[model samples]
Target: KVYKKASPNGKLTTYLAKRDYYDHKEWQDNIDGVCVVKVFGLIVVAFRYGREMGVSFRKDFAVKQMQIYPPLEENQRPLTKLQAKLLNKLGENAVPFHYDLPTNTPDTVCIQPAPCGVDYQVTTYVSQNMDDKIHKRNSVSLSIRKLSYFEFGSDEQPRGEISKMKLECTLDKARYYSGESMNISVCVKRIKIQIIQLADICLYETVTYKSVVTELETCQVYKLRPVLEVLALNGKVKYEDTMLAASTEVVVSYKVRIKMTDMLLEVPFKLCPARLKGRL
Candidate 1:
């Protein structure tokens, strides 16, 4: 949302916007991770990161930048290998520049209850077509997100699922993307139908936006018969998946929890921006 006046005429103004992108280009780590931007005029795009406090409290460092119009030439391709690599990442029609994520650079996240947290954003300035008279101008600000392997792993849980009484189950792994079925190894050693007489399964999601965790949840649950007759409670069971939509804010973090009735059980897993390329 960075901006200034567009022109002395004060009739029209232009704004450049960027969409949410994963540090992992298209959601894969091996390839280059990049950000995408939309422009209405000749502009300069720069990638920056720093802590946000009073006035952003950042001496912001430049990760990458390039002129969207007046495209780069032979010598302008950049001397550094990263700049050169990023120079070619954007596609046609919708143009953007690639950037080298500083090795070990902190991911885009907010620590709640704390006044400050790390953040990343793209800043663009309208260039060229000088107005000659104090050149009216404006800029756009958009946030970008980076997800870390260690952080993703820590937020996801798939084991040690069970209650003090009877039911118990273990999920295969904790990381998965949309359109996938969840595997659960279930067992009801002592249903003791004496108390509760039915089996219930549920799957749901929680999204963290603007650094604040939402108390409300997006849940998915299974519907079974009123009563149970020694249901085929064994082997593996698959749960329906819910499609997650991108929000006005970043998909900062995602979680899918598996839960059952009586012998309560819950498993939490991270939802990645895209499918895992290879092993990760």
Candidate 2:
């Protein structure tokens, strides 16, 4: 790199660098995090992270309390740790920093109407006074967003009776991979049944912007159901399982369910088929 004096040629003159070193290797996406901080006129930089779940009842929340970064504990999990040397660079500088992400963390979300969410940042102060907290003039802070996909949960759904005491209907797993089918079981003691229609389909999707309650995430369906049949009564119908649609947002999973009824009773169920990755 070179510099020289000249006319109004945009900073007088520009020179091409004769030599440079660059790191362009492939890297993991979000299993960890990264940030580049730059400061001018004798620059220094640092990083931090803060995890918060907004308590629903607090109003006019305090920002100072949010500065609970870099927790203090002998065995504390490192939510944000820079994978770089401390910057002692001077006169306009840029440095890259990264972190070892935690295993148990939800995707980046913002639910309105309530103040609950996680956030992080890095700050630099243009301070002249080292000991005076009230004398600093200007400081800048950068906000960072973190997100990831989850792969597991407890399979829970409700059981109900339909078409009188003649039919027992049971739902399969509540959570599944996007490409799986829902399964159901039945018993017949000669119960009068023919066609089963399980059509209340929804794909709940939730997004958090500012606070968790600011735009609360609800039973918001984030998936869509497809048309599929599980049973036919031309024969003495006893058992059947229907396939489902799946989500590739991460991968696919399937849930299996069972229940019993008599022809004097019958197990009649509706399986909302999704991405058809697995059968019930």
Off by over 4 Å in 2: 1-92, 102-109, 114-116, 120-142, 152-280
Question: Highest TM-score, which number?
Answer: 1
Model 1 bad stretches (over 4 Å): 1-21, 24-98, 102-121, 126-157, 161-165, 189-261, 276-280
6 Cα displacement, candidate 2 (Å): 29
Q: Give the clashing pairs for model 1.
A: 25-33
What lDDT does the true structure give each of the candidates?
A: 0.34, 0.25
- How would you encode candidate 1's per-residue C-alpha lDDT over 169-209 as one tens digit per residue? 55545655434444544543221111111111110122223
For lDDT, the strongest prediction is 1
Candidate 2, residues 44-99: lDDT per residue as tens digits?
Answer: 21111222352222222112111111222432233333222222221123222223
